[PDB]
Amino acid sequence: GPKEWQENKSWNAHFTEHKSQGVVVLWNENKQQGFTNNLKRANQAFLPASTFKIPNSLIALDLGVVKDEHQVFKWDGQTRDIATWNRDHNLITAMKYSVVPVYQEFARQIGEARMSKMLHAFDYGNEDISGNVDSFWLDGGIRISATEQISFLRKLYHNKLHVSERSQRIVKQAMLTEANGDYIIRAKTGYSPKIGWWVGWVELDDNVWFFAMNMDMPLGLRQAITKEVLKQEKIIP
Amino acid sequence: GPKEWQENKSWNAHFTEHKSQGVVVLWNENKQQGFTNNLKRANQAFLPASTFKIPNSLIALDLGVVKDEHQVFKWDGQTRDIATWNRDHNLITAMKYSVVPVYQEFARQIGEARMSKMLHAFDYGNEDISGNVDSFWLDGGIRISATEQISFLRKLYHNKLHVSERSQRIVKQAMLTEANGDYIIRAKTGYSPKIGWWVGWVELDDNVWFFAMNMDMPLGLRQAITKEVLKQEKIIP
Ligand SMILES: [Cl-]
């Protein structure tokens, strides 16, 4: 009978087209079935990089480190290389522009004990915050696979994570990336030197498709390759 | 001192382009200043038509008539003129396709006493539900102006309406109409033979512009005219 996970290697063409190497993982929520071009890489655990802003946001909200999505976190006045980082931000814009220093301050206020407890409660990756509490998702020991990202995102979608419903609704709002009359994408990018990510889901009228992709050494290719797979599968026009 | 409200009649060109007549009202949240092509019409009261799905959704959720945005309201099997109505819906798709019969069922469950009490607590228009409990926003006594729509929407945006924060967040999610890297639109269309509406807001990185437009005897002109004003004011590209 049918399998929970099927391999579709025709998606490799979308990586080959860009001389890229990576994995796309899709989960059809109605059918309760997943699809990927590479089942091995789909289960390979990598640094989450800025995809960690999803659980980090949830924890900061649930503990009151972030009061709501409108609270302003003032620029500390240090000029950094990414220009959009050198300004005041709220939760919405800090996630949109992947503003690392804003989330590093969240993480310090959360603190290591609560961060580790919350990641265990979330069943998140290898749950390992070794390193600095304000950088482990960038250069420490935490590792999460694409299928583990799907599992985490499905819990978030269904408000099943062990944080308040309010925290989950606000983070799903902050994840909003694109919407029109055909679909809604809620997602988060991530970039580290060796790995780039895009994880999230596509809401349709009568189904949800969760996705998690990563690729070696990326940036716009993360969304472009993912969208080529979504188009091939007729999920988006 | 500066004016809270200013009239810009140059926007009339976007109406007369289509041999149309109406009002657009804009509110700049950061500046606390409003702009309109027609100050008198901005404050005249009209039937809300399907813009009433915003307060109706809020009330149905707060009273538990609708449990959440996933609850399915099955098609009653009656083939109606609008094809997208002849199917099962949840709150998200019922608002997207303006599915009148789903919301009439909400209104019947809410009932006259609780509907009137809620609209009073919302300060919603003339607070008058005279007419049929399940059609007064289409052919009964309720009236609201464009500036009153703005004031109601600002309360919703800030979670200041009387109902639970949860109900307000769910309805703001259901109002999602369009999103990209430049802006987010949360809005609701309204149509009756007499009046057409588009009300909502545009979220930018560091500001939000509320809008309410109505126009005589309409359909796509509602959004098209509003966007021509937003483009003229450099709110959207
Ligand atoms: Cl949203």
Numbering used by the authors:
A (entry chain A), B (entry chain B): 21 to 238, 243 to 261
The publication says:
The OXA-48 carbapenemase is widely disseminated in Enterobacterales, necessitating new treatments for producer strains. Here we describe investigations on how avibactam and nacubactam inhibit OXA-48 and two variants, OXA-163 and OXA-405, with deletions in the β5–β6 loop neighbouring the active site that modify activity towards different β-lactam classes.
Both OXA-163 and OXA-405 assemble as homodimers in the asymmetric unit. Consistent with their high overall sequence identities, they adopt very similar overall folds and active site arrangements compared to OXA-48. The exception is the Ser70 nucleophile, which is in dual conformations in one of the two chains in the crystallographic dimers of uncomplexed OXA-163 and OXA-405.
